[PDB]
Amino acid sequence: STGSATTTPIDSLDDAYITPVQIGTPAQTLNLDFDTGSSDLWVFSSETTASEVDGQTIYTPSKSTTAKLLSGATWSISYGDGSSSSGDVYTDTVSVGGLTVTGQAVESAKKVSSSFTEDSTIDGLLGLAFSTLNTVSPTQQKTFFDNAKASLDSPVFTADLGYHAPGTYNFGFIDTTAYTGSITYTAVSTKQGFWEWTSTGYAVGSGTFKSTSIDGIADTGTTLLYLPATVVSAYWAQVSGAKSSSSVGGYVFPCSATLPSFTFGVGSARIVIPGDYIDFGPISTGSSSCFGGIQSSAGIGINIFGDVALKAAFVVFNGATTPTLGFASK
């Protein structure tokens, strides 16, 4: 089997991407944030505290003939941005782009933090990291990908995120028309439960490539590119007037600037992030200070190849017995 679904930016900045997901019978379609950095499929629901729902579409398990309470199971998750959610668990039928999993754990939110309430466009998350990170207790549950894997034509999914435009998540096949040149594959460590890999270096603009190992995670659920302070300083040093602002929470730059590109290495291959992808706009409405899309990972504890980086590539998440990651230009 295979599946193919379009993923759409939630706003003009590409702050996140939503993908429609069918849950239950008859189908209830929710727009979920596909997150390769976590491993829970959770939704706003009829059980979510009413004051914490503000415009989201909810899953109502009592209206699904295939929903079953997973007795005794609870979940609770906290994300790198400080947001969180928790609740109980149903199993139900879940389909993405024509690919159907029966008995998928659908984690129903009883509580969500303010960041989730305040974002009307995201109805929940669909985790695509390794199932070892799944938070369901006392019996850990499998991700949608893990459940689908054996049935897929090939045990892979691909992320093709757009810049200010829709893109695609495919399951079970590699669309050879979706990228240019060749896909370069690179080793993955699953020891922390992430799609963790080592970039071979970077360049800023038309500058020379610096060969240096940068361990990090491919994370579709993180907006920005978080890299070591040395790397980030070298980037922003090429933008007149750019500075790290403790008050704003990162590097800012004059909105009048033209940003240089940023290149990262995948083996001997190179992925080029155009400068415009690094512009996240005014820090506040009407400001001439703009927020940068490359930020320091110092104090996160890990480097994160988030959407800023991934949307410059066609990315293969290869879930073979020994997982790997592939990157192509597009």
Side-chain angles (χ1 to χ4, degrees), residues 1-62 64-67 69-109 112-141 143-148 150-190 192-242 244-330:
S1 61
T2 65
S4 184
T6 298
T7 193
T8 301
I10 65 165
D11 62 25
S12 63
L13 296 178
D14 297 349
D15 281 318
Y17 298 78
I18 50 174
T19 309
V21 178
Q22 282 70 51
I23 309 176
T25 309
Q28 299 180 37
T29 299
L30 275 65
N31 296 328
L32 304 187
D33 183 351
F34 282 25
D35 180 14
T36 63
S38 70
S39 305
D40 289 49
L41 191 176
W42 75 260
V43 297
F44 278 77
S45 74
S46 56
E47 304 179 324
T48 310
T49 302
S51 62
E52 293 176 356
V53 184
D54 189 2
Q56 296 80 9
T57 294
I58 63 167
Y59 169 58
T60 302
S62 66
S64 173
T65 59
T66 42
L69 179 72
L70 186 62
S71 181
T74 61
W75 62 279
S76 179
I77 193 165
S78 299
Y79 297 102
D81 66 348
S83 71
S84 61
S85 52
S86 62
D88 54 17
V89 187
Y90 292 83
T91 56
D92 209 338
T93 301
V94 171
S95 300
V96 176
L99 172 64
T100 300
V101 168
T102 59
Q104 174 65 44
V106 176
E107 302 172 34
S108 168
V112 303
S113 66
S114 59
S115 177
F116 288 114
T117 300
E118 290 161 1
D119 182 11
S120 65
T121 71
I122 291 175
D123 302 324
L125 267 64
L126 190 149
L128 293 167
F130 293 87
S131 294
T132 54
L133 294 180
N134 175 266
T135 78
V136 178
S137 175
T139 307
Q140 187 171 63
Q141 301 293 304
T143 70
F144 176 81
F145 179 52
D146 222 338
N147 282 322
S151 305
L152 294 178
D153 290 358
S154 179
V156 307
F157 68 91
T158 65
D160 181 6
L161 303 180
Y163 168 65
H164 293 351
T168 307
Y169 281 102
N170 291 329
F171 292 83
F173 72 106
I174 288 156
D175 179 357
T176 60
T177 73
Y179 57 87
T180 63
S182 297
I183 305 177
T184 297
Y185 290 86
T186 196
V188 164
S189 170
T190 64
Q192 294 191 77
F194 301 121
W195 293 92
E196 187 170 4
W197 64 290
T198 303
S199 171
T200 48
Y202 70 97
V204 175
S206 59
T208 63
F209 187 85
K210 175 75 169 178
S211 294
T212 184
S213 296
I214 302 169
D215 295 339
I217 67 168
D219 186 0
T220 57
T222 290
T223 313
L224 307 185
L225 175 53
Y226 295 89
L227 293 172
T230 47
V231 178
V232 175
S233 183
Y235 179 80
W236 289 108
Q238 297 304 309
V239 178
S240 192
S244 180
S245 168
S246 53
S247 57
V248 175
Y251 280 90
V252 298
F253 68 94
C255 293
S256 61
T258 299
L259 298 178
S261 64
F262 183 90
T263 301
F264 63 94
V266 182
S268 55
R270 307 287 180 254
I271 300 293
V272 180
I273 305 172
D276 294 341
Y277 288 27
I278 297 160
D279 178 12
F280 279 74
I283 60 173
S284 296
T285 303
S287 178
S288 71
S289 184
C290 274
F291 198 67
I294 296 176
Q295 296 294 344
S296 178
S297 65
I300 294 175
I302 198 159
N303 301 305
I304 307 173
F305 294 87
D307 299 333
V308 162
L310 303 181
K311 77 187 176 194
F314 177 87
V315 188
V316 181
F317 294 80
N318 169 28
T321 302
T322 300
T324 66
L325 273 173
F327 293 82
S329 295
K330 67 188 183 190

